[PDB]
Structure formats: structure tokens, C-alpha cells
A paper describes a structure:
Here we report five cryo-EM structures of [name] in its apo form and in complex with the inhibitors [name]-8438, [name]-9289, and [name]-8749, as well as CaM. Within the TRPC1/4/5 sub-group, [name] and TRPC5 share the highest sequence identity of 70%. Both proteins can form homo-tetrameric channels that allow the passage of Ca2+, but also Na+ ions to a lesser extent. The cytosolic domain harboring the ankyrin repeat (AR) embraces the coiled coil helix in the center and the N-terminal ankyrin domain is associated with the TM domain via a helical linker domain.
In the [name]-8438-bound structure, we found an additional density compared to the apo structure inside a cavity formed by the VSL domain, TRP helix and re-entrant loop. The chemical structure of [name]-8438 consists of three six-membered rings: a pyridazinone ring and trifluoromethyl benzyl group at opposing ends are connected by a central 1,4-disubstituted piperazinone ring. The nitrogen, the chlorine, and the oxo group of the pyridazinone ring form hydrogen bonds as well as halogen bonds with N442 of helix S3, Y373 of helix S1 and S488 of the S4 helix, respectively. The hydrophobic part of the pyridazinone ring is stabilized by a π-π stacking interaction with F413 of helix S2 on one side and M441 of helix S3 on the opposite side. The tri-fluoromethyl benzyl group engages in a hydrophobic interaction with L495 of helix S4, and the fluoride group is involved in a hydrogen bond with H369 of S1 and Y646 from the TRP helix. We hypothesize that the direct stabilizing interaction with the TRP helix constrains it and the adjacent S6 helix thereby arresting the channel in a closed state.
Author numbering:
A (entry chain B): 187 to 272, 284 to 317, 324 to 388, 391 to 659, 696 to 732
B (entry chain A): 459 to 659, 696 to 732
C (entry chain A): 187 to 272
The structure:
């Protein structure tokens, strides 16, 4: 009934429970409390939106406290008992699942993770080793395959080797796709049988889709689509299946031969080629996803990635302007659809004409004007109706001014200020992403490149309890007793 | 080839042409190396150094860009390679008066996609003799997407990065410029070359004493005036 | 065996030896100590990369101290004897 009092009371309660002192005193397990409280506050930040800043700051407070708690450890065994609590690193899995960015990127977690990554030298001491072990990968694959023995199968299980093998397989896939269009490998005819390399690339597409469905089994399109890098995988795989199906159905319908020129649109072979081309584009773009593993490109790639949701807003304001001017010009010019004696119409032939006749052609005309690829004579008619021609030219000029002078500088002027607040959290986010990548190459889940894809729980709480006692002691002594002295003086 | 014949009726890989090309490139490089002495001035020096250090920030982008270029080249070449007409056309490629066969092979595709950044590629290059309007439309759409990505997302994220990378450069301009100038100056002190290009055909046991005395005095002055009288202007706390 | 303790100990030692007071007290020649220490710290900044900010700041500290030491000269002959040494 009393909304104001009720909401303020809820805010007071949450502002209370997120206090490091109270958590240190009345809590069975501080880490779980920090995680749960951060999640709950973050979620309420979106529904109680009128009070939005307070919750978005309390979440930050909880995360910082969680990091500082683990800060004051002193021996690697203590850390390893903290992380291996409930397989290995279940605590780390939970932290990742709860988006504790400031917790994972902590200079002690990274040391342990790197040490368990490499398992064993400036610029060429590694650059030749990696490529060389990348070439002769299939021998290792088959050896682990048929004889998962101590000989060389134990030389795949090291994650830094599994990663190299997987990326070498990916590079091979890309090379095959690149040479798939060479002229060395035919007489174009109707519904041909699969070429010599289609049978070669089929295993890659099948293995990729197998891995995709396998991994999808868990998320089930929920809490699993949020990542943008995965939606591309979905669409590529669907497109590849579509290509397979179209090539099949074409092979058995038009089983003959005739010159390619005398075909018609919507012929199955052409649709089978187009989507294949698009899929090639998408795979070669998906290549970029592994730059997060480097160190000079990683941070930059993440920074560029986050400054994209800032752009879609402009590519949504721009569409309205485009529609307005398209409407206007099309309404003005649609009386002069000559198309008499001209073999090719539109804005694409050698001598552009009928630029604004219909509406689709108007959209194309106005989109291609951003790059200055539309000549200036397109705004004429056979008659000398100089008034209409002048008004058309004026609409065109106004559109050009608006776009290329007000909607392209207000984009840079926005990107700069939106980027200022991005370089203050670069290392944290990059390291979090790198860790997310690394952890995927630890379990014995796939362990295989694509082409070849055919007392204990009652007692151990004691040590962890002891460690929590010691850590809380250290923290409360050295963080809220000796940092409460260097504050300042007032009246 | 100690003879004489009209230049037109030669062939590529003739030694004289290769002897002229590299000479031209060397001329380019020397005239560029000219800039190296601007560090000796005072109005250009700092600016030149500042521009020089903000180059390793760019190579990262000229490495991200190559991946995009390869992706779209792959796509378009795969789509168009069925129409290598080259019948009745004297000059093929994107360089002749009437551009054609823009996407036939892969090298020509790389050239086509690189020359589109400056808007030097006309729009009719994406046609075929037949009216296969579906393929033509898809080709035009790939081309347009590539243009948008490059000239609107990979050219403004370059300025937006240069600005913030340059902010932390103007706070150490004089130091670096003076260091570079000194490095230049010291090279003209010893009697090493002393000649322009065309015409190119007690003592060590005792002196430690004074320097020891000077160190004693300097350390005295420093410890007195830097960690005794600067430890007083700090501030108050609880 | 204990990577954490070992690394933290090395950091503590280097953070100690780069102190202007200790250098002023226990050093035969302060300038050479500043130069060598700055070089060593800068080099370790690239191998012990997980602790990267601390070393990249200790190098700055050493360089600043080296400048301030030569700051407090008073006569050109003193400076010229400082620079012409070997
Ligand atoms: O997630 C994807 C997308 N991938 C698919 C999946 N289904 N259909 C496709 O077309 C593509 Cl390209 C393969 C690449 N990776 C992962 C990855 C990234 C970087 C290095 C190596 C790997 C790999 F070795 F683990 F594969
Ligand atoms: C700025 C002075 C321009 C004068 C040029 C001129 O007189 O030609 C009319 C121009 C268009 O040029 P024409 O149509 O070719 O005459 O109209 C505009 O672009 C207005 C800009 C709209 C601005 C919002
Ligand atoms: C912004 C609305 C543009 C509408 C213009 C249009 O309908 O023509 C299709 C355009 C290309 O133009 P045409 O191929 O000539 O039709 O496709 C794109 O450029 C998509 C941009 C890709 C963006 C990532
Ligand atoms: Ca995936």
C-alpha cells in the first residue's frame, strides 16, 4: 500500500547485509554468501529500476570483498584446497558461473592456472616448436585413437597440445575451403556429382555439428545462446545442412547437361552455390575467436567487441532517416519508369538509370550513396521538367548532408566517450575471457580433433573450515582495523 | 643483350626492366629516410617522435583487418568463379578502362577488395552476361556488407583508439625528444668518420679521490634535503 | 615447490633493495647500482608477467632516484667530473 516506505525498507535491508563486517561475523561460508548476494542484487537492479545506481554499486562492493578475502593467502596448498572444494576446481567453475570477474583475474589464480596449463625461448624459441608440433598432428591423433596407451596418448592430454592440434585442424579446414574454388580441380553442367574435395570436407562439417549438438545438450538454448560467438556456429551449421540437402535434391531431378547461360533463377544448383559461399564467409570470420588467447591482440579484440552494442543504436536511428527520404523520392519520381530500349535497368549497369523508379531500387540507391558510388545524372527525366529535377536534386543533397556530416561525426564523437570507460577494465575482462577459454581444454570431454570423430566428503570440510577461520582472522585484522586509521580529519 | 630493338617489343622479366624497378623503389626509400633529421629541430622534433611511437598501436589493426579481407575474398571468389569470360576483351582485370572480371580469380579478388576502400571500384563489376538476378543480388550484398564493416566500423574504431593511445603520449614528449636529440648529437663528437660520403677513399689510481669526495657531498645534500625536509609536508590522519 | 611463497619472497627482496635510503647507506657507487637495478627489474618485468605492474613501477622509481641524485650539484666542475668518469 505504501510503496515508498516499503521500497526504502528493502533498500535498507540489502544495504545492510552487504557489509564485510557482518558477513565475517554471521556467515557459515563467506564466499557463497558473496556470490549469492551479488547475483540477487544484480537481478534486482533491473526490476527496481528507479533505484538503479545503488544496487549496481552494491554488486561491485560484494565482488570486491570476495576478491579481497581470497587475497590474504600465504601457501599454495591453502589456495589449492580453497579452489578444489564442493573433478577439480569446482569453486572456479562456480566463480565463472557467477561472473566474478575481479575474482578470477587475481594474480594468484592466474599463476596456478598457467602452471597447470603449460606443464612444459623469447620469440623463436617457441614459434618454431608450436608450428612443427602443429604439422604432424594426425599421427598423434591416430596413436591416441587406437592405442590410448602410455606411448604418446599421454602427450595429447597436456592441454597446450590439445589446443594446438585443434587449431591446426581448423587451419587445415580453412585451407581446403580456400582451394575449393581453384580452377585446377571443371566443366560446369547441371546437377553435378560431388567433386573430389566435397568428399574431403564432409568430415569437418559433420564433426563440427556433432560437437555443437553435444555441447548444446546442457544449455538447451537457454543460458546458452547469450554468447554471440555461438549463434554464428548455429547459423553456419544450418546453412551447411541446407547446402547438403539442396545438392542432393538437385542431383536427382535434373540429371543432364546444358550450357550454364541458358538456365533460370531459382535453379537448385545456383541456390546450392550461394549458401555455400555465405557459409565460407562465416567460417573465415569465426576464425577471429581465438585471438583472445594471445596477449597483444586479446585486450584489443575484447575492447572492440564490447563497443558494438553502442553502435546498433545508431544503425537503428539511421534506418528511420533512410526510410523517410526513400519515401519522399519514390513518391516524387515514380512517374517516369521508362525502361524502353534499355537492356539493363537499375543502378548497377554501366549507365545507371531508373534509380528512383520503384521503392526497392530507391533503398539501394540511397544506401550506395554513402560511399559515393552513385553518379549525379540519375536525377533526370527525358522531358525538361526543371522544377521537378531541381527538387529531386535538393532532396538528394539534403540526405547526403545529413548522413555523411551529421550522422557520421556524431558516431565518432560518441565512440570516443564510450571508449574512455572501457580501457579502465581491459586486463580484468581479457583475463576472464582467457580463463573461460582455458578451462574448456581441461576435462576429458572431446580430446579429439574434428575429422577423427567416428573420510573423503565428511572429513575434508575440517581443513577448509580451518582455512576459513585463518583467512577471516587475517582479513579482519589487516583490512578493517589498520585501514580505518588512514582516513583524514574533520571538525 | 648487347644490341638494340624497340622497347615495345620486349617481354617481362627482361633484365633492364627489373633494373629500373628496384632503382625506383630505392629512390622512394632514400627520400623517405630524409625525415630522420627532423629530430634536430624544435618545432617538428617532438611531433615527429610522438607520431613515431604511435605506430605500433596501428599494426594491430592492420592485422585484424587482414582477416576480414580474407574472409570476404574467400566468399566472393567462391561465388563468382564460374564466369571467367575473357572473350573479346583486350585487357582484363580491374585496371583497364572498362573494369571486368573483378572477382574471377583470387588475386584479382584481393585487389578488388583493397581498392574499394578509396571508392575506386565502380558498381557494375558485379554482373554477368546472363540475368541470374539472384546470384547478382547476393554478390552485391556481400560487397555492401564488406564496405559497411570496413569503412564504418574498422575506420572509426581506429580513430577512437588513436585518441586514447595519444593521451598518454603528450605527458612525456620533451623527455623523449631530448633523449633522441642527445643520441643524435653524441654521434658527431668522436673523430670517427669526419668526412662526407663522396670523399671516402696518478691518473686512473688517483682521480677516484675527487669523485669519491663529490659523491660524499652529493649524498649528504640529497639525504638532508630530500628525505628529511620532504618527510614533513605529508598530511594528518587519525 | 611452493611457487607462491617463493615468488612473493623475490618480490619483497627487490622491493627492498630499490629504496633510496638503503642505496645511500650501503653502496659503493650509487649511480651504477641504480642503473643495474633498473635494468634487472625491467628485464624481470617480462618473465614474471603475472606480477607485471610492480616491477614496471620499481623501474620508474629507480630512474627517478638516479635523476634526483645528480640534481643537487652546484658548480660546473663538479658536473664535469661526474660525467667524465670510467
Ligand atoms: O567454436 C568454434 C567454431 N567452429 C565451427 C563449428 N561448427 N561449424 C563451423 O563452421 C565452425 Cl567454423 C570451429 C572453431 N571453434 C572453436 C575453435 C576456435 C579457435 C581455435 C580452435 C577451435 C576448435 F578447435 F576448438 F574448433
Ligand atoms: C550550404 C549552402 C548550399 C548551397 C548549394 C545550393 O544552392 O544548391 C542547392 C543544394 C543542392 O544542390 P542542387 O540541388 O544540385 O542545386 O541544396 C542543399 O544541398 C541544401 C543543404 C541542406 C542543409 C540542411
Ligand atoms: C541499413 C539498411 C540498408 C538497406 C539497403 C538494401 O536493402 O540493400 C541491400 C544492401 C546492399 O545493397 P544491394 O546489394 O545493392 O541491394 O545490403 C546491405 O548493405 C546490408 C548492410 C549490412 C549491415 C551489417
Ligand atoms: Ca560453441
Amino acid at each position: 500500500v505504501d510503496s515508498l516506505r516499503h521500497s526504502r525498507s528493502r533498500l535498507n535491508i540489502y544495504k545492510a547485509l552487504a557489509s564485510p563486517s557482518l558477513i565475517a561475523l554471521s556467515s557459515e561460508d563467506p564466499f557463497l554468501t558473496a556470490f549469492q548476494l551479488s547475483w540477487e542484487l544484480q537481478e534486482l537492479s533491473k526490476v527496481e529500476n528507479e533505484f538503479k545506481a545503488e544496487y549496481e554499486e552494491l554488486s561491485h562492493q560484494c565482488k570486491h570483498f570476495a576478491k579481497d578475502l581470497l587475497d590474504q593467502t600465504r601457501s599454495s596448498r591453502e589456495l589449492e584446497l580453497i579452489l578444489n572444494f564442493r573433478n577439480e576446481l569446482a569453486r572456479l567453475k562456480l566463480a565463472i558461473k557467477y561472473r566474478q570477474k575481479e575474482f578470477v583475474a587475481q594474480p594468484n589464480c592466474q599463476q596456478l592456472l598457467a602452471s597447470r596449463w603449460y606443464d612444459e625461448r623469447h620469440w623463436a624459441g617457441k614459434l618454431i616448436t608450436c608450428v612443427f608440433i602443429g604439422l604432424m598432428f594426425p599421427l598423434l591423433s591416430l596413436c591416441y585413437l587406437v592405442a590410448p596407451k602410455s606411448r604418446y596418448g599421454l602427450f595429447i592430454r597436456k592441454p597446450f597440445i590439445k589446443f594446438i592440434c585443434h587449431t591446426a585442424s581448423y587451419l587445415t579446414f580453412l585451407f581446403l575451403l580456400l582451394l575449393a574454388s581453384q580452377h585446377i580441380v571443371n566443366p560446369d553442367r547441371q546437377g553435378p556429382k560431388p567433386t573430389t574435395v566435397e568428399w574431403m570436407i564432409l568430415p569437418w562439417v559433420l564433426g563440427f555439428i556433432w560437437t555443437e549438438i553435444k555441447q548444446m545438450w546442457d544449455g538447451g538454448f537457454q543460458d546458452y545462446i547469450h554468447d554471440w560467438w555461438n549463434l554464428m556456429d548455429f547459423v553456419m551449421n544450418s546453412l551447411y545442412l541446407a547446402t547438403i540437402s539442396l545438392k542432393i535434391v538437385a542431383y536427382v531431378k535434373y540429371s543432364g547437361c546444358k550450357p550454364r547461360d541458358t538456365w533460370e533463377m531459382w535453379h537448385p544448383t545456383l541456390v546450392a552455390e550461394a549458401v555455400f559461399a555465405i557459409a565460407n564467409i562465416f567460417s573465415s570470420l569465426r576464425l577471429i575467436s581465438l585471438f583472445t588467447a594471445n596477449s597483444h591482440l586479446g585486450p584489443l579484440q575484447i575492447s572492440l567487441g564490447r563497443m558494438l552494442l553502442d553502435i546498433l543504436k545508431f544503425l537503428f536511428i539511421y534506418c528511420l532517416v533512410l526510410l523517410a527520404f526513400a519515401n519522399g523520392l519514390n513518391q516524387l519520381y515514380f512517374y517516369y519508369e521508362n525502361s524502353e530500349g534499355m537492356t539493363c535497368k537499375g543502378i548497377r549497369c554501366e549507365r545507371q538509370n531508373n534509380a528512383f523508379s520503384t521503392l526497392f531500387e530507391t533503398l539501394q540507391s540511397l544506401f550506395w550513396s554513402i560511399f559515393g558510388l552513385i553518379s549525379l545524372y540519375v536525377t533526370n527525366v527525358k522531358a525538361d521538367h526543371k522544377f521537378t529535377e531541381f527538387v529531386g536534386a535538393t532532396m538528394f543533397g539534403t540526405y547526403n548532408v545529413i548522413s555523411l556530416v551529421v550522422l557520421l561525426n556524431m558516431l565518432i564523437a560518441m565512440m570516443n566517450n564510450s571508449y574512455q570507460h572501457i580501457a579502465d577494465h581491459a586486463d580484468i575482462e581479457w583475463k576472464f575471457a582467457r580463463t573461460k577459454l582455458w578451462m574448456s581444454y581441461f576435462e576429458e570431454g572431446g580430446t579429439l580433433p574434428p575429422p577423427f570423430n567416428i573420510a573423503e566428503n565428511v572429513r575434508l570440510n575440517h581443513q577448509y573450515q580451518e582455512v576459513l577461520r585463518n583467512l577471516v582472522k587475517r582479513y579482519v585484522a589487516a583490512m578493517i582495523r589498520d585501514a580505518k586509521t588512514e582516513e583524514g580529519l574533520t571538525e
